[PDB]
Symmetry: C2
Subunit: 702 residues, 2 copies
C-alpha cells in the first residue's frame, strides 16, 4: 500500500474503471477492436504472450503466433473474494468492487494494489535489453506483498480431452498444440484437478487438498498461500506462470520451434524447469530491469508522460505476434519476425520497420542485424507467378529481382519462405523500400559503434543492387526515381508523382549512406558512382521542390504543394546516421517550423499529433484519407527530428498528442494497443501497430 | 468531477496526515506552523488569509508583517445530512455543528493563484467541488491588490443546500461589532460584518456574499453567536436581520443557497472581501493599503469590493488562465517543475507584503516584501538579488519602485551607533555610499528607518553594493532595454556603490578584500582575501556599469570601469581558477571548498547578456564540479546543492552555512545550469528542492518553502523570499 516500487511515470488506472470515450475503427472493412480492457503483456520474444488486463482477467491470447484471440479465460485468477473486476464457476465471489484498487504499468513491469488486510503484486517477465536468453522465456513472475492468496489456472491445452536448497510447489496432455502450462509458488518463512459450478475448489472459502494425477470433457489446478499477519507485519510471496508450447505453426504448413527451446529443450514437458528458474532468479531479473531503466527514469528534465510512452510502447516487441525460430520441426541462425500488426498480417514490413525498429537496433541489436540479413538474402529472389493487385486489379510479378520485398510473409501462410504476402499494391515498383533498406543497414552499423564491418560485407551486394534498380526508375533524367502517380510507397493510398519530398529525400540519404559504406570497404568504383548520382539528385531535388517556406509534396500531383509531415524523412535519418546536411539547415529548420505551425497546430489544437497532409491555407488536405490521418509512428519520428534540431518545445508538444490520445483520461483508450492512425474525431485504424515504436528514436543521443 | 484542474496541481487528500514533516534545526526561537497549509487568499498588500488543505481559514497575515496561525472555527463552508466541510474539531465553542469531515473522502488541489476542493463522501450522494482564488495577474497593478477571494462552487433527485464567517473586527476583543445585510443586470445578497468610525488599524469591515444564478434560492442568517454552541444557526440547517451592536459575545453571519438538482450541474459563486484600509507598524507609522486607491480609505467599502468580484470573476479566470498557458501548454517541461514554478509565487502575497497609498494624516506607491517572518526585514537586498525574479518578470513596475527606494537610500548617513548582535561591538547604523541591508522591519518603521537588521554590520559587506548594481541593470534588461529613465534615476547610486567598494581593495589587485570577519551574506561561513562569490559579483557589476555608461554617454565612467574590470578579471583568474573550479577564496582555512554560489556574477552576467566575464570552458567545468560534488554527493542528489563541499567529497564542516542547502541558491544554480546546456543536471538539481518541499517523500514545506535545510531535512526560516528564484529558470533567450 505504498511500500512497493511503483515509479511515478507508470500508467495508472482504477481497477474496474469504465472509460466512456473509447474510439472505434474508422473503416468499414474487417478490423480488430478488443476495446479498452487491456494491460501490459507477459511473455518473452517468440514465446507468445498473454494480456493480463487492468480488471485482472487473463484476456488477450497471442499464444498462437501471429493471431489475436480476446476472451477472458475466467478460471485464471488470483483470489484473496476473487480479484477480477467482473455461466460457469458460479460459486466464486465475482464483481470485485470499484474505487477499491489500482493498476500500474511501466513495461515490462506492472502492478496491482488491492485496497477494499491490504495486498499488492508486481508482475513482469525478464524483458531486458542486450539479453537474448531470458528475454526469450515463456515466463511470468508475480511478486505479491501483503501488509489466503491463491493462483487458480485452467488447463489450456487445446484452446480438452487428455489432460493430467530452494522450496517451491503442471497441466499437460497424455500424448508424447501439445505442451504444458505450469503455475506454482515458492516457500518463504511463512489442489490439482478442478471442474471448469466450481464449488469443487471454492472450500477454499474457509481454509480441499486433493492431488489427482485425466479427463475427456474442464480440468484445472490451484496453488494457495496461507498465513496469519501479526499486526504491523508485512510478508512477501513470489508466484509464477510458465508455458511450454514449443511449436508454432502457420496457416500455410510450416511448423517451427520457439526460441526458448534452445534453453529448455524442444520436448514440450519442461514447464516446471522454466517456472523453477523463474522463482529462484526473479530477484536478479528485477535488478537487471531497474538498471537499464534508471538512466531515463532518473533524468528529471524529461516529463513523466514521455517516460510512460517510451517504456510502455515496448509492449509490442513481444506482443506483435512475434516469431523467433529455433529450427523447423523435421530437420546456425534464429530467424526473427515482428508483425506490422494483426489486421495487416505481414512480418517485418520494411517500410514500417524503418520507423518501428529503433528499439531493436538500440536495445537488441543482434536481433536487428539478423532481420536485416534476412532482407539481404531476399533481394535477388525472383518469383514470376503473377498476382492480382488489390487497388486497381492489375496483374503483376510477385517478386522481381533486385527489389527489396515489402514483407517476409504472413502468419496465415509461410513466414520467411513466401514473401510479399502484401497485395494491395505492387511492392516491386515502390520507390521508398530500396532506399529504406540501404538506410536501415547503415543505421544498424552507426548505432552499434561503426565496428561491424562483417555486417556491411554481408549486405553490400544487396545495397548496391537496391540503388541500381531504383536508378532505373528515373524516367526524366533528373537523377531521382519518379513516383508513378499511384501509391508506390508506405502511404499506400496517397499517390505521389514525379519527384516527391519523401521518396526523394530517402534516395538522397540512401546515396550518401552507400557513399560512406563505399569508403569503409575500399571500393572507389561504387564511391564515385554514388557521389556523382548524389550531386545531380541533390541539386535537382532542391530546385524542383523548395518553395521558400517548405519542400513541396511533389512536382506532378494536383496536391503537389501540400505540406507533408514526413517531407524530410531522408534528412531525419541522415542526422541519426551522421551523414550531415543533405539539405540546408535553414530550409530544414524552416520546413520543421511549418509542419509544426500547420500540420500540428492547425489540427485539433495540436493535441492529437501531426496530421499527414496540410494545404498551404491551413486546412487538412482531402486528396486521400491518409492525408487526413495522424500516423502515430510518423508523429513520434517527427518529434525526434525536431528535438535534434533544437525545436525542443515543439518536439514534445508534437509527441504529447500521441501520448494523450493513447494513454490519458482525455484520450481514446488505446493503451497497449497503439494504432497506426487516427482521424480528427480520434477514431482509429489498425490497432496494435509496429510503427509507433519509433518513439525510441527520441532517445538517440549525440 | 466536471472541472478543469491542471495536471501540475499540487494535490493532497483532505484530512491526510503527514508522517515525516521537518522542524527547526536551530536552538533560537523559530516559527513552525506545521504541514497543514494551503494557497493563500488575497492580493498584494491587502493582507492574506491561508485556508489550509483541511478547509480551515488558519494562517492570518492580515496584520501586515505578522503571522498568526490559529483556526477561526466559525469560518467555513457547510453541505446539507448536515456537515461542515473542515477535517477537524472546534476545546469548546460552535459545538452543535457537524465536525470531523471524514478522511479518505476529498482532495485539495493547488496551482497558485487558483486552488480547488473536491468533496466525495459515501453519505453525500450529491458531489461538490470548489475552485477558490484572488485575481493575481501579471502586468496588472489593480485587481492584483484587491482584498478579495471568489469561491466558484460546482455541484453535480436531491436538493443540496452555507458560507459562515465570524466578524473578525477586533481579532487584531469584540465590542461595537454589527452585521448588516445588503441586497443589491445581476442580483447579490451579502453580509457585512463591521463596527465606530475611526481611521485606526483594527477598524473596517469584512463581508461575504453570493450571486443569484437561475435554479438556486438564497437564504441568510445574520447574527449568530460565535462564542455560543452555534444552535442559533445549526438548528435552521431564520432569515432574520439584527443590526444590534454586540458587547462581550463574538458575532458572525452566514450566507447560503438552496438548490434542486436532478440526475444536472449547478455553478454558484460565493465570495469573501475585507476592507481594513490601514496598516500600522510597530513603531507607530500608519499607512493606507494599495487597494484603497480603487475603492477608498474610510473602511466601509467591503461590499463594493465583493460586488466587483461576483460581477467580474469569470473575466479574471480567463486572465489567470491566459498567463498560465504558455508554461502549462509546454509539454517539454515536467509537471513537478510547473507545480514549483507557480506555487512558489504564493510568497509575493504571503510575505508580509506592504504596498502603500499614503501615510495616515505623493506620486509613488512604496512597496515591500519580507525576507521572511522570523527575520522580519523588508526587501533584504541579498535575498532579493535571488528572489525578486517573479517581480521583474511579472510585475516590473513594482520592481523598479523597489530599486528606486534603494537608489534613494545609498546616500543616507545615520551616524548613530547600534550594538552588533553577533559580537557586542558598536558600529555605525548606516554609512553613506553603502547600500542598506534592508528597508526596515514591520516591528519598527518600514521605508523610514532602514537597516533594521543588527546581527552583523552590513556597512562593510562586500557583496551588496555589487548586487544592487546588478539588480538595476537586470531590471533595465528584463524590461526590454528601453527604460532609460530608470537608468538615469539610478545612475549616481550605481557609481557611488561601485566607487565605495573599490576603496576596500586594500591589496591593489583590483577586487574588494574580504576581511575574515562577517562581511557578506555567508556571514558565519566567512571569507577572506578575494572570494569567488564577492569577486565574481564585482566583475559582473563593473561590466554592467560600463554598459549603463555607454547607454547614458558617460565616457569618463565607461573608461574607468573598463580599466578596473580588465585588471580585476586578470587577477580573479590568477588567484582562484584551479582548472576544475574556482576556489572559495585565497586566505581562509576552507579556501579550496567547492561553493555552490561560486560563480554568482556570471549567472547574472548571462541574464544581463554581459557576455563571458569568465571563460565558457571554466564555467562549464565549475558547474560540472558543483553538480558532481555539491549535489550528487550530498544525500545522493535528492535535496538540492549543499553550499560547501571539500575537495575530498566530504561536506565542508567549517560552518553551519556550509552544510545547509539554501533553496534560493539551488534554484539559481539550476537556472544557470539550464542556460549553459546542462539540462539534465539543472532539472535534477532543482528537483530535490521540489521533492523536499512538495512530495510524499519530502518534509512538508508546501506554502512555507524555507531558506534552508541540513542533511536530515530539518529547516531554517520557513516562509522565505529566496526560493522565488525558481523564476530565473523561466528567463527567455
Ligand atoms: Ca525522376
Ligand atoms: Ca583585493
Amino acid at each position: 500500500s505504498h511500500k512497493i516500487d511503483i515509479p511515478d511515470s507508470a500508467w495508472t488506472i482504477g481497477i474496474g474503471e469504465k472509460f466512456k470515450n473509447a474510439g472505434h475503427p474508422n473503416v468499414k472493412y474487417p478490423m480488430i477492436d478488443d476495446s479498452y480492457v487491456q494491460g501490459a503483456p507477459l511473455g518473452g520474444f517468440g514465446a507468445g504472450t498473454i494480456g493480463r488486463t487492468y480488471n485482472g482477467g487473463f484476456s488477450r491470447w497471442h499464444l498462437e503466433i501471429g493471431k489475436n484471440k480476446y476472451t477472458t479465460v475466467y478460471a485464471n485468477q488470483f483470489s484473496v473474494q476473487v480479484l477480477y473486476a467482473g455461466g460457469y464457476l458460479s460459486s466464486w465471489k465475482w464483481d470485485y468492487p470499484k474505487e477499491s484498487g489500482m493498476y500500474y504499468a511501466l513495461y515490462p513491469n506492472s502492478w496491482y494494489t488491492y485496497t477494499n488486510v491490504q495486498l499488492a503484486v508486481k508482475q513482469f517477465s525478464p524483458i531486458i535489453p542486450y539479453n537474448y536468453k531470458e528475454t526469450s522465456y515463456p515466463v511470468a513472475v508475480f511478486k505479491w506483498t501483503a501488509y489466503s492468496i491463491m493462483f487458480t489456472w485452467q488447463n489450456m491445452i487445446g484452446f480438452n480431452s487428455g489432460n493430467f536448497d530452494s522450496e517451491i510447489v503442471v497441466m499437460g496432455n497424455i500424448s508424447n498444440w501439445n505442451g504444458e502450462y505450469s503455475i506454482g509458488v515458492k516457500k518463504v518463512p511463512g489442489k490439482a484437478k478442478f471442474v471448469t459450478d466450481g464449488s469443487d475448489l471454492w472450500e477454499f472459502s474457509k481454509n480441499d487438498n486433493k492431488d489427482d494425477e485425466p479427463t475427456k470433457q474442464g480440468i484445472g489446478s490451484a496453488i494457495a498461500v496461507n498465513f496469519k499477519l501479526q499486526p504491523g507485519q508485512t510478508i512477501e510471496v513470489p508466484f509464477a506462470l510458465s508455458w511450454d508450447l514449443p511449436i508454432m505453426k502457420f496457416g500455410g504448413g510450416d511448423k517451427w520451434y520457439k526460441m526458448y527451446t534452445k534453453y529448455f529443450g524442444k520436448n514440450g514437458k519442461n514447464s516446471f524447469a522454466i517456472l523453477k528458474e523463474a522463482l529462484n532468479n526473479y530477484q536478479k531479473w528485477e535488478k537487471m530491469i531497474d538498471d537499464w531503466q534508471k538512466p531515463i527514469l532518473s533524468n528529471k528534465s524529461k516529463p513523466d508522460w514521455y517516460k510512460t510512452a517510451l517504456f510502455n510502447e515496448l509492449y509490442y516487441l513481444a506482443d506483435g505476434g512475434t516469431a523467433w525460430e529455433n529450427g523447423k520441426v523435421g530437420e546456425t541462425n534464429n530467424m526473427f519476425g515482428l508483425l506490422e500488426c494483426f489486421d495487416y498480417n505481414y512480418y517485418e514490413t520494411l517500410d514500417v520497420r524503418f520507423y518501428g525498429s529503433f528499439p531493436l537496433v538500440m536495445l537488441w541489436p543482434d536481433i536487428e542485424k539478423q532481420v536485416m540479413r534476412q532482407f539481404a538474402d531476399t533481394i535477388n529472389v525472383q518469383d514470376s507467378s503473377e498476382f492480382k493487385v488489390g487497388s486497381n486489379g492489375a496483374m503483376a510479378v510477385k517478386k522481381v529481382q533486385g527489389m527489396i520485398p515489402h514483407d517476409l510473409g504472413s502468419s496465415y501462410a509461410l513466414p520467411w519462405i513466401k514473401i510479399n504476402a502484401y497485395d494491395w499494391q505492387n511492392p516491386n515498383i515502390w520507390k521508398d523500400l530500396n532506399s529504406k533498406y540501404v538506410l536501415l543497414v547503415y543505421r544498424d552499423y552507426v548505432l552499434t559503434g561503426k565496428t561491424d564491418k562483417e555486417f556491411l560485407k554481408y549486405t553490400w551486394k544487396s545495397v548496391k543492387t537496391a540503388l541500381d534498380k531504383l536508378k532505373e526508375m528515373d524516367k526524366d533524367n533528373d537523377g531521382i526515381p519518379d513516383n508513378e502517380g499511384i501509391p508506390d510507397q508506405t502511404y499506400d493510398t496517397w499517390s505521389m508523382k514525379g519527384t516527391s519530398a519523401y521518396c526523394g529525400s530517402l534516395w538522397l540519404a540512401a546515396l550518401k549512406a552507400a557513399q560512406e559504406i563505399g569508403k569503409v570497404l575500399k571500393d572507389n568504383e561504387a564511391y564515385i558512382k554514388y557521389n556523382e548520382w548524389y550531386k545531380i539528385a541533390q541539386q535537382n531535388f532542391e530546385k524542383e521542390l523548395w518553395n521558400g517556406e517548405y519542400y513541396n509534396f511533389d512536382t506532378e500531383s494536383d496536391h503537389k504543394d501540400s505540406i507533408m509531415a514526413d517531407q524530410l524523412a531522408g534528412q531525419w535519418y541522415a542526422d541519426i546516421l551522421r551523414l550531415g546536411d543533405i539539405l540546408p539547415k535553414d530550409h530544414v529548420q524552416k520546413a520543421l517550423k511549418k509542419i509544426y505551425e500547420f500540420n500540428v497546430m492547425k489540427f485539433e489544437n495540436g493535441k492529437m499529433g501531426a496530421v499527414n497532409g496540410m494545404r498551404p491555407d491551413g486546412i487538412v488536405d482531402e486528396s486521400d484519407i491518409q492525408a487526413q490521418e495522424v500516423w502515430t509512428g510518423v508523429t513520434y519520428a517527427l518529434a525526434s527530428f525536431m528535438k535534434y534540431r533544437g525545436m525542443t518545445e515543439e518536439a514534445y508538444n508534437t509527441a504529447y498528442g500521441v501520448y494523450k490520445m493513447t494513454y490519458d483520461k482525455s484520450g481514446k483508450g488505446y493503451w497497449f494497443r497503439t494504432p497506426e492512425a487516427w482521424t480528427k474525431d480520434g477514431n482509429y485504424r489498425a490497432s496494435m501497430y509496429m510503427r509507433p515504436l519509433s518513439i525510441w528514436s527520441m532517445e538517440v543521443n549525440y
